[PDB]
């Protein structure tokens, strides 16, 4: 797209503020940003806020979101679909033209770990180019295992294909499959989907801790067989809904857009790989590390 | 197959009748029928009754089915395998030769949303050519959320490949992935697996209603990440067994042959896409619409 | 690998012995062994003990395993990762060089049907070449349906690719997808992953019996849609954890590395195919048989 040649829009911070006990404002951008997805490989991604996946959003169960999208893309319209919300797609997930803004309001009544993504036709194109992310909705009533959790992180899985190539998007294997981490608390890492960052800079934890991971496989196209090497999931909440409780899972199957809350104990010092156990995907990038110290 | 050149057998209605408090007769055909699977694209399908997927069958838990297959295919044998039933495959799912009939009897003791399909070797060929469908077995004891359901429909997902091409069937990506709807009550639509009908003629509902969808992914080869845009599933019953209860799912993973009952509320007027969230499949047809009016 | 030309190391029996009420010794080899994976097709597999999948391991919940690996491969290092255990991957799943041994100790505190596999980089290569298997951890407290089970077997699903071809491993469809059975009691079959043995020599059962299958899909790359033709699963325990209970499932979705305990009744004499319902995989080998006699 001629109007994207040479474009590299610097990342813009997410903006959120609470405006009532059950109402939260969120402002995001759609913007075109170069991201290094593998060593030596730049992808001129379509993004929210200059990150792919996009910035993490966290709200409380029962919050109504008053969402603004500022479209900085000079030529392509963009939109927002939060899986967390109840909304009319044809009224509330509609396009925002280049250099314009739109505001949409809708409730997040269900706890969990939801995908968000651009909803502009062709949606495959917009997602595959990088317009995906996660919104976490915290349960009013928490999770039954909250008291045991010692540390937590967010991990997102996505694929990368040949750049902006609809034939490949539809018909081809992924070039890369990758994890990223999005920060929940100051000091947490905040990374993009790439083959290397979470190997070079592992997530951190201490011996004996119970770790919670909030996870989502945003696709676009693949399912995920999520596994932490050297442990077993004590507890799993499918989609992050506290009612959807499994125990003692080795591996969690995630559909495309599928989420979970998973919890596990790291018993010994060392480095613990985190994979999709579809090992072709692991080999093309989808291995993160968790470094556990005494 | 030379004996299928020029063959286009008109659709024949399903025949069912109850013959006892726990016994039901069902008669189907195997027949060769041209179906438009994408605009401008005819597939000379192998079918039950001239539909692909085949006609919907609904029985009650505990019914014994006395099933007759009339094979109208002039040259290929066909058979029937209902996932709902307990049967000896080598006695009860056996071939019916061209221009012959066979009758088989077996019980449906388990509630749910089951695949049915031809079972003739190579089964991949028979399924991929269109010999698939759904049988719903209604639970004696209903579902706990029956009182809240305002409207219901059946949706089936299948793939289409290059015509009658075993290499493609085994090794290739699907050409199309599609939804169809099969009628439960007079006035409901009854469609075949194609890329366009349920976009052109959306399923209908009213604002505020809780909708139930009976769903099955018949494959042949792909899994499905089933999602309704703009809502969250309040309740999910995996395989349609009332005991297999999930809540607050964004997306339901379905294996090949996998079913579910899913329920969700449409809160606002508008059009709600229904997808597999494996967006390569969505892009090659697997988007249906639900139009919600005041 | 020049040092593997002409190498065909005879299978070596697994060695296990209990050394305390909660401690068990296990010794395995890594070795290079020719296996006929399809009629006329030899694969010079990388194996544990000359089987692919490897030998079955069964321990009790709460057992600590003191595991020795003897690496007989003349040139490639190998390792062991049991999904059953809690361990430091970087200390306990480390490489054993050619012609050396290593011993590692770790607990199996969680009941279920776990994958084990080589953990040497590239792990895709080691798994795809055949270094996979199952460890069953028996629950202290059994399964609630134990009293109804009349007969049981272990089945494992894996894929085979072009020999030792990392491009194919990462990017290609599987050449074959296969079941094997691993013996639990004297007289049970013990087979390798191939397209034909469990068709030629079906698993055996008697009319009316409730059968339990312990199942795992070791991949490397595919998910599985596990189904027994002519029955419905009465009970399913995901990953073999008794708490993860489903009922009345037609088909069980298994991630890569995913396990289950599944139980079903065979009501009539005959032969019952056992498939992955991803029928492209079934067609490339993944059909086993269960012969049921009066
Ligand atoms: Cl409440
Ligand atoms: Cl692993
Ligand atoms: Cl009852
Ligand atoms: Cl969507
Ligand atoms: Cl206990
Ligand atoms: Cl089948
Ligand atoms: Cu309040
Ligand atoms: Cu308000
Ligand atoms: Cu308000
Ligand atoms: Cu690279
Ligand atoms: Cu506002
Ligand atoms: Cu967009
Ligand atoms: Cu979506
Ligand atoms: Cu609540
Ligand atoms: Cu701590
Ligand atoms: Cu927290
Ligand atoms: Cu291209
Ligand atoms: Cu793919
Ligand atoms: Cu892939
Ligand atoms: Cu702790
Ligand atoms: Cu634990
Ligand atoms: Cu616990
Ligand atoms: Cu626990
Ligand atoms: Cu529970
Ligand atoms: Cu009666
Ligand atoms: Cu009767
Ligand atoms: Cu009778
Ligand atoms: Cu077309
Ligand atoms: Cu009759
Ligand atoms: Cu047929
Ligand atoms: Cu079937
Ligand atoms: Cu019942
Ligand atoms: Cu109504
Ligand atoms: Cu009804
Ligand atoms: Cu061909
Ligand atoms: Cu496929
Ligand atoms: Cu596909
Ligand atoms: Cu209502
Ligand atoms: Cu609701
Ligand atoms: Cu409700
Ligand atoms: Cu509810
Ligand atoms: Cu429930
Ligand atoms: Cu003891
Ligand atoms: Cu001890
Ligand atoms: Cu000890
Ligand atoms: Cu062959
Ligand atoms: Cu010892
Ligand atoms: Cu190895
Ligand atoms: Cu593993
Ligand atoms: Cu226990
Ligand atoms: Cu018996
Ligand atoms: Cu036993
Ligand atoms: Cu090659
Ligand atoms: Cu594959
Ligand atoms: Cu495949
Ligand atoms: Cu019995
Ligand atoms: Cu039964
Ligand atoms: Cu039972
Ligand atoms: Cu039962
Ligand atoms: Cu239960």
TrEMBL record, chains A, B, C:
Domain Plastocyanin-like: start-end pairs: 32-141, 179-293
Molecular-function GO term, any one: copper ion binding
Positions bound to Cu(2+) 4: 25, 66
Keyword line: Copper, Metal-binding, Oxidoreductase, Repeat, Signal
List of residues binding Cu(2+) 19: 234
Positions annotated to bind Cu(2+) 10: 81, 227
Annotated Cu(2+) 13 binding sites: 150
Binding-site positions, Cu(2+) 16: 209
Residues at which Cu(2+) 5 binds: 36
Residues that bind Cu(2+) 1: 4
Binding site for Cu(2+) 6: 38
Binding-site residues for Cu(2+) 7, renumbered to this chain: 61
Binding site for Cu(2+) 11: 83, 117
Residues the record lists as binding Cu cation: 78, 83, 117-118, 126, 131, 277
Binding residues annotated for Cu(2+) 20, in chain numbering: 245
Residues that coordinate or bind Cu(2+) 9: 81, 83, 117, 277
UniProt cofactor(s): Cu(2+); Cu(+)
List of residues binding Cu(2+) 14: 152
Binding site for Cu(2+) 3: 23
Chain residues that bind Cu(2+) 8: 78, 118, 126, 131
Subunit structure: Homotrimer.
Record protein name field: Copper-containing nitrite reductase
Organism the protein comes from: Geobacillus thermodenitrificans (strain NG80-2)
Span within the parent record: 47 to 340 of 352
